[PDB]
Design a protein around this ligand. Structure first.
Ligand SMILES: NS(=O)(=O)c1cc(C(=O)O)c(NCc2ccco2)cc1Cl
Ligand SMILES: NS(=O)(=O)c1cc(C(=O)O)c(NCc2ccco2)cc1Cl
Ligand code: FES
Ligand code: FES
Lengths: 75, 75
């Protein structure tokens, strides 16, 4: 049967679970001029160094089956 | 009682639900030189123009109670 399967539905789960929860919409804005050679930005909301990627996405992806990863601005 | 409350637990929900699901870890990398005056990057995995923000985060935040928003690289 399909009695164990949750049918297709509009998502209700949060993405960010703990970061800056007194801020109603977390936005970051950086000037290119202040960036060094490389900046690696977190898109999974699990990094301890958010907004910078710290490799936490690997645990997120393994535990949930997801496929997210960071955004890189270089040169 | 607390019979309606889901206790604190390690997350199991995905963040990305539909984007590039044949890619096992979605990473984007851009050279500053190719960026114009402003780039607004999606961190919610709902944008129709992912990896660029299209304001979909507003619906995500309203429907789930979350507080995520984009990453801006300017100048
Ligand atoms: N697309 S990938 O697997 O080769 C890749 C993957 C990753 C990754 O971290 O998975 C990455 N992050 C660099 C980093 C991590 C912490 C600080 O900088 C960069 C790249 Cl190019
Ligand atoms: N922190 S905020 O509420 O003032 C803000 C909020 C947003 C926002 O979209 O919520 C934003 N996005 C600009 C955009 C949207 C689509 C293309 O560029 C920029 C800013 Cl500075
Ligand atoms: S730690 Fe979040 S994308 Fe790498
Ligand atoms: S649409 Fe995803 S952060 Fe704006």
């Amino acid at each position: 049967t399909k009695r164990f399967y949750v049918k297709d539905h509009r998502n209700k789960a949060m993405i960010n679970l703990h970061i800056q929860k007194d801020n109603p919409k977390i936005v970051h804005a950086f000037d290119m001029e202040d960036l060094g050679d490389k900046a690696v930005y977190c898109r999974c909301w699990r990094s301890k160094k958010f907004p910078f990627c710290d490799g936490a996405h690997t645990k997120h992806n393994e535990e949930t089956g997801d496929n997210v990863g960071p955004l890189i601005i270089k040169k």
